[PDB]
Symmetry: D2
């Protein structure tokens, strides 16, 4: 452990995220097949754009979830500044 407060994921949450990552995994191998089949660079870039888009989506979702629940809990419990600093670090990371 050795980290900020966390609300554990449900069977539901894990399942949903998982599909999104599977779909994304598929897209990634789809792109793999495209490169192997020597498909047009533009077609490939379109799919890459799709992937990046799907990643921002799942990433934002996890960000909001963590802030709305886990960080919110820490604020209630008294470890908010700890959790807030973590949160700011990943924000700057997504900016770097």
């Amino acid at each position: 452990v050795l980290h900020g407060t966390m609300i554990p994921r449900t069977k539901e949450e894990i399942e949903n995220i998982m599909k999104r990552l599977k779909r994304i995994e598929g897209q990634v191998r789809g792109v793999q097949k495209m490169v192997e089949d020597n498909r047009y660079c533009i077609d490939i870039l379109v799919q890459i754009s799709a992937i990046q888009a799907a990643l921002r989506q799942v990433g934002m979702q996890l960000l909001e979830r963590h802030a709305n629940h886990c960080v919110a809990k820490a604020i209630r419990e008294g470890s908010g500044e700890q959790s807030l600093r973590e949160l700011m670090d990943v924000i700057k990371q997504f900016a770097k």
Copy 2:
């Protein structure tokens, strides 16, 4: 076909890109395992940030390759405006 001029990829080009997509595929399943193991949301977000970063890298590489070779060839061959319009569309796509 029915698309702009393309310079076909070498055994070399395909191999290199492929590793990058494999590594990225790994990262994606790594993230999958992380979610399943109910790992900390922040740790997961860091890895997602890594993935998006690796995707921008391979995407930019493919973009430059296509422009430097394929689009450049079309300009020489006389189908440059065709290839240029395609290129502008994917740029706007990466912006949307």
Copy 3:
């Protein structure tokens, strides 16, 4: 008022940010003069890229400042969740 906790800016903080916005204001009018003088589109785009860069910089700075001080204070004072929700909204805004 009617908003989350705020630590007021110093004479110092206001001065520093101000220079950065002035410089940015200059860049913006520089770009204005460039357009008027019918300068090359590429040169103009380079300067626009500069401006956007300078804006991300000052924006991130204000973001960190607000989180490190104002939001941190609210967490101590007991209005952290209020301040956290605000913070998440502007994050999503910078993403939209």
Copy 4:
């Protein structure tokens, strides 16, 4: 000069872009007044988000204009690869 082919801007084009940069200039000074009046950091960030948004808009517009007309002309005239390389440089610049 010493640059790729350029189609000069009309009285119209200059006028339109100009308004957009003026509005943006206003926003920038609006933000200046906000900082001076010691307004809430969140309110300021919202306006900064607005500005960055308006800059992407005018920037993309100039990008498309340059590609659709100036770079397209160079391709017809025989200096397309020259103009294409310039265009790729500013793309990478907006990515750096």
